[PDB]
Amino acid sequence: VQWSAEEKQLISSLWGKVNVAECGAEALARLLIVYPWTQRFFTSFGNLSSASAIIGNPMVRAHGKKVLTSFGDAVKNLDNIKNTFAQLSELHCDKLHVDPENFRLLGDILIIVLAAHFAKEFTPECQAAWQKLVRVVAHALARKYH
């Protein structure tokens, strides 16, 4: 992938304004609730027995923060995404056997979380740039599946 100057500006600028803990918790709660088969991977987190429980579950919240911190580590180093995610690829693929289609699903959810968070600042160009990012991170994460 090749990043334009425009794209890097849109991505870093908005990242700088993200509340990670909030958007992380939103993103993971939504993964589990919009796509409930993904709960299979997170049974160790405790009470997942309703939407309110998923949303109030302290492990979902913590885990969410770490996922979106992970995306920040792409944002910080946009030309070395493949390597930034190499151990994560092994974890998700070689050990967890999370199908890659779920990485796409998480990214789409993150776009919608950001939309809600930023309103009109989340311009079309900005959405374009952030979709490319989640798509490039999804690809880096599927690398050791292949």
């Binding site: 939504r30 919009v34 919608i112 809600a116 989340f122 079309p124 959405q127 374009a128």
Partner: protein, 138 residues
């Protein structure tokens, strides 16, 4: 299928966005063509520049189709009768683009209506967009 709760959630989002359907239809396509440029090739007979009368005119129709599906949500196949031949048989729209358009629609609602798409309501609206996709690609 769409559960009772799903139909209530989707009717409830459409009640709130209904007065702006037309402007959200437009924005949805603008975002579709910008975020996923490969989708432009379906509209090569449109001027596809920001604020085009064709894009705005078409957005209005797409949002209206969604409003009608929401209004007759018990039977979306029948309500969206005539759009299925067109998308599936004539336009030969790759099924993957339906999620893209749906994804762009939810970004528009989220932008304008924070706290409307709770996780649950998001889940319901996702199942609604999917059932609509399924009708258009059959």
């Amino acid at each position: 299928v769409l559960s009772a709760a799903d139909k209530t959630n989707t009717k409830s989002v459409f009640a709130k966005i209904g007065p702006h359907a037309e402007e959200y239809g437009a924005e949805t396509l603008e975002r579709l063509f910008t975020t996923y440029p490969q989708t432009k090739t379906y509209f090569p007979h449109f001027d596809l520049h920001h604020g085009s009368a064709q894009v705005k005119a078409h957005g209005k129709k797409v949002a209206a189709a969604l409003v009608e599906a929401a209004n007759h949500i018990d039977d979306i196949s029948t309500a969206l009768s005539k759009l299925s031949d067109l998308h599936a048989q004539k336009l030969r729209v790759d099924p993957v683009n339906f999620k893209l358009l749906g994804q762009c629609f939810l970004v528009v609602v989220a932008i304008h209506h924070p706290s409307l798409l709770t996780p649950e309501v998001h889940a319901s609206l996702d199942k609604f967009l999917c059932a609509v996709a399924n009708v258009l690609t059959a």
